[PDB]
Structure formats: structure tokens, C-alpha cells
Design a binder for this molecule. Sequence first.
Ligand SMILES: c1ccc(CNc2ncnc3[nH]cnc23)cc1
Ligand SMILES: c1ccc(CNc2ncnc3[nH]cnc23)cc1
Ligand code: NA
Ligand code: NA
Lengths: 162, 162
Amino acid sequence: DPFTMGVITSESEYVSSLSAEKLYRGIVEDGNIIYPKALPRFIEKAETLEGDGGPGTIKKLTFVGDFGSTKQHIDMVDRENCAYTYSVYEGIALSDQPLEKIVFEFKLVPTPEEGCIVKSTTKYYTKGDDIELSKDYLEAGIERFEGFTKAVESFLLANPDY
Amino acid sequence: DPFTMGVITSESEYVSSLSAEKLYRGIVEDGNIIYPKALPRFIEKAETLEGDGGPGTIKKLTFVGDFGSTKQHIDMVDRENCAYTYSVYEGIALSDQPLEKIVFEFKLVPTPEEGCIVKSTTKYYTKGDDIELSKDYLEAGIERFEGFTKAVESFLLANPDY
Ligand SMILES: c1ccc(CNc2ncnc3[nH]cnc23)cc1
Ligand SMILES: c1ccc(CNc2ncnc3[nH]cnc23)cc1
Ligand code: NA
Ligand code: NA
């Protein structure tokens, strides 16, 4: 009768033209104003429910439309190294596979040629005794996460006055 | 002390290469298999909860990710004229403006040159005594609706074996 758990990691990278510090400040420090400006058709509202922005903080995205809302629980905030981690605990099941949580993580690494390399990771933690997860689902999470980051980067470039 | 209600309509059109009857059959008759194939990163599951497919039927979309699920209540089904209408009643509020319902409507009109003209309409019905709705929200609904139709059309063209 063993105890079983899966951790499934997806990693994706891309090179941003925006500097690491600006991209970091935008998402992590000004998320509450920038998320709805950069994704005005998808994110209706980004707000803080508990805490000051550091580890332990609970933030909340409300989506435009009949897509609900979701809470982010903030795990690591590292300004010096432009690194951010949070967890979502609710509404994360697939129609077949329950999840204990999803963890989202980025590190922005400054490059000379450009702004920075954006390193994004998603980790799905599985509830239960077996595992079934499809390419499309695994890729959807990483693709959405990286998309939020991309939209915030386009916004800040088109609007340096932030 | 009057009774006040707003009906806000958005209409959008585009020309499909796929014939009206194929596009209609795909969404309305085979939605349960085609929605998750055409939008495999967004729609996890499309299923019928009540009824046989005609007016009165309650269908349900489950979204990929922490985006919830939503029910469609089917109002008009017109195979002859390729016309379909349904309503969503739940989770439709904006952060400022409550809605009584959202109605979605398409008519596909066959053209000689191509497949058909896809006419899409969204109607937002407002709960309350005043009205505040922004360009971005109004456009998001119509854009999503028309997007579902576009994804189903690309799929059926790339896969005529359906
Ligand atoms: C699978 C898993 C996740 C997603 C998209 N959710 C998501 N992505 C990124 N950041 C978030 N904060 C709250 N929810 C999210 C899509 C598919
Ligand atoms: C505002 C209103 C609606 C949307 C997207 N919902 C939506 N669009 C189309 N068909 C549906 N069936 C169930 N929900 C929907 C986005 C913004
Ligand atoms: Na909403
Ligand atoms: Na889901």
C-alpha cells in the first residue's frame, strides 16, 4: 500500500527585449494595475487579499467573462535575482486527473544583446494512486503562464511611462 | 420608480471557406466531440446535461485549466437556415455591472464564392438601475464566440473526415 505522488514539470524559455528589472517590477510589483492593462480582454481584475506582496501573500485574478476567478499563493519573491513563485490550489482538476496544486515559477536572466531570458516553469502535483495527463493539458498551463508574461512585456514596451 | 433594463448587442461577421451545413453540423450536432478537438487547449469537455439537442437542451463546457465550467441553455435550433441561439445565466457579472443573461446567436448564410457568411451576435442583458460597460468587455464576448466558431471551422477544413 504505498504513498504515490507525481511532479510533472514543464519548462519554456524566451528572450525578452524588455530588461529583467522592468519586466519583474511590472508583474510582481505593479500586477494589480498592469495585468488588466496588458490583458484587457482576459484579466478583469488583479488584487491582493492578504499580505504585503512578499511570501505568504494571497493575490486574486478575476477573469473577463464566465471564466471565474482564481487565487495565487505567493511562495518566493526575489527582487535581486528577478525570481517569483506562486501556487494555485483550487479548480485545478482535469476531468480525469485530480491535482494537489500547480506551481508557477519564473526567473528573468539579463542578457547583453537584449533585455533578458525569461525562464518559466509550471509544476503539476498529482493527487492519487495513478497518473494520466495529456500533451495538450501540460502545454496549456505553461503556454498560458508564458503568455501572461509576454502580454505584460508588450504592454510595458509600448508604454514605458510605467 | 421605474423598471429599467439594457440590451446591448454586438454583431460581427466573417466569410468562411467551409460550407454552412458543415460548420453548422460541426458546432451544433457534433459539438460534444468537435469542441475539444478544435480547441484542445481551452475546452476540456463539451457534454449534454438535459435534452436531445433541440430547444430546452442544457449543454456544458468545461474549460482546460483553472477557468471553471459554464452551462449553455439552448433556445433555437434551425437546421434548415443554419441558425443557433443559446443563453448563459451564471458567472456573467462584471466587477461593476451585474447581468441577467448573455445570449449568443449565429446564422450561417451560404455564399457562392465561398462557403458562407458567419453572422454572430452577442446580447448582454443588464440587471439593475444603471449601466456601465466598457469597450473591452463588450468586445471580449463577441470575440470569444466568434473565435470558437473560427476554431471549429479550421478544424473541419483540416479534417474533412468528420
Ligand atoms: C492549466 C493550468 C493553468 C492554466 C492557466 N492558469 C494560470 N496560469 C498562470 N498563472 C495563473 N494564476 C492563476 N491561474 C493561472 C491553464 C491550463
Ligand atoms: C464575456 C462574455 C462571454 C465570454 C466568453 N463566454 C462564452 N462565449 C461563447 N460561448 C460561450 N458558452 C459559454 N460561455 C461562452 C467572454 C467575455
Ligand atoms: Na467574470
Ligand atoms: Na478545468
